[model samples]
Target: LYFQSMNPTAEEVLSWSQNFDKMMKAPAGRNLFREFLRTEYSEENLLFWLACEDLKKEQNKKVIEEKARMIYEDYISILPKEVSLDSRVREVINRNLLDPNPHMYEDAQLQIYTLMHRDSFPRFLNSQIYKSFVESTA
Candidate 1:
């Protein structure tokens, strides 16, 4: 899938790769970004492309799918896994992708989920402005 011609960052890329399908019209589309230029702030599209780099470690399709499912369920605001049908669908559901509170799933399962699924995440996973504001926080 194509993103607007804007820069994204490493953290953003990680989110994109975690849930890439949310951005694609079909399954055959390029799910992740392969390379990224070092911009001052990460572009939205670059985040996804870079995140896909981690997913490259998957040995087989099943591993890839399972990771995708978990990331989708965890970060992406999608239907519950019980209703969602797919081989890779994450068995664990977080139910708080867009929550305002700062709860995060830093579990190994989630990290695995993040690694496998970031490619299918949405374009606005966390807005660049939000990211910029967070950057200013520290």
Candidate 2:
């Protein structure tokens, strides 16, 4: 009910679910998707996606390093809400930690992106949360 005015159009929400670029491009889309993600006990997907967005925007090497380390520990390593990445992505992440950079998490982020696209996005499209959100906004 809250923040409903900020919701994306029903059409936009449909497109957002179908395209990762659109989903990332719209703040409102992200917010709505995030609300849905929170209920699925997978808010980490949006969190990691947002963190990667910030990482890409960062210019300071030191700051990037710090952010990369935090992201790794929080989502990549054996930490709470850790994203379930495949072994190959896990290996790449571990190696990236050896020389952390803004782009180090790129591969891992892509993996998570595909995961959300294939897994959560479909469920989100069918879920009552998304349905009701679109209905209320409409």
Candidate 3:
């Protein structure tokens, strides 16, 4: 009752209607939004955002190193399923890998976030998935 946790109430999902901000503000319920993206086989974008936060939370240097490698290996394929960065940012990642800090994937999140926000985001909001949630709410 205090927080929405992973499951948002009906209204919250509906408000996700106008702008993407609702989702950002109520990150607790993001998985439900993420779930919809997954239905379209498009949640890897979510993974990037999730992975960004995942890196920020850990304090242990051991896991940070481990996570940096994992994030790279997972997303490293073919511009990362077509995520090409300018050579400039990758230098950060390559060097970031050696150092392995939480911000290792920071640029990647911004890079990917733009694509998702403009491209897939429209489809995600336009899709029947959200309609059902709102309809169900009523």
Candidate 4:
């Protein structure tokens, strides 16, 4: 699949294979990685991660509440696109819904991060699709 770059830096493109932390920390790398996830039909993993990060930066109460609801419906609700999170994280999220805040999805976010790091990141590194990206970027 051909990825449309969202303005990647040379550093971000080169670090795709260096480590997951480096890749995710760079918006360019994350965008490309998100594109890869879409091809795998597991885009929710990246969607959830991005939403979680966005929420963390929120400072306004109304915005936090709004975003939290949106994020829940987008990735935590029972709809088909919902990402798989453990029951414990679900419990905390449920509790936080009563009193929504910027940090509401911390546990869930970390869980998804670990999920991608352990499950998807390795496969992404080895995929022909990613190799093609590396080649083109190089």
- Top lDDT hit: 4
- Sort the candidates on TM-score, descending order: 4, 2, 3, 1
Question: Against the unseen true structure, what C-alpha lDDT does each candidate score?
Answer: 0.36, 0.81, 0.72, 0.85
* Predicted candidate 3 versus true structure: per-residue lDDT over 54-126, tens digit per residue: 8899999899888877788787545354355667777778876767798878887788777777877777666
Residues 1-138, candidate 2: write the lDDT tens digits: 435536467787667655867876788877778988889889998799889888989999899898998898888878477888889888887887878778878887888888888888888889898788777867
Candidate 1 lDDT over residue span 2-55, tens digit each: 354234444544443344543232221232222121222223233333333434
The TM-score, computed over Cα atoms with residue i paired to residue i, of candidate 3 is 0.79
Candidate 4 lDDT over 1-138, as tens digits, reads: 124456665666876687898889776777778887878888888889989999999998899999999999999999658889899889989988989999899999999999999988888898877788877876
Candidate 4 wrongly placed segments (more than 4 Å)? 1-9
C-alpha lDDT of residue 70 in model 3: 78
Poorly placed runs, candidate 2 (over 4 Å) = 1-14
Give the better candidate number (1 or 4) by lDDT: 4
What is the model-wide C-alpha lDDT for candidate 1? 0.36
Q: Candidate 3 — which residues are off by over 4 angstroms?
A: 1-4, 24-29, 77-83
Cα misplacement distance, residue 56 of candidate 3 (Å): 0.7
Pick the winner on TM-score between candidates 1 and 2.
2
Q: Report the CA-based lDDT of candidate 3 relative to the real structure.
A: 0.72
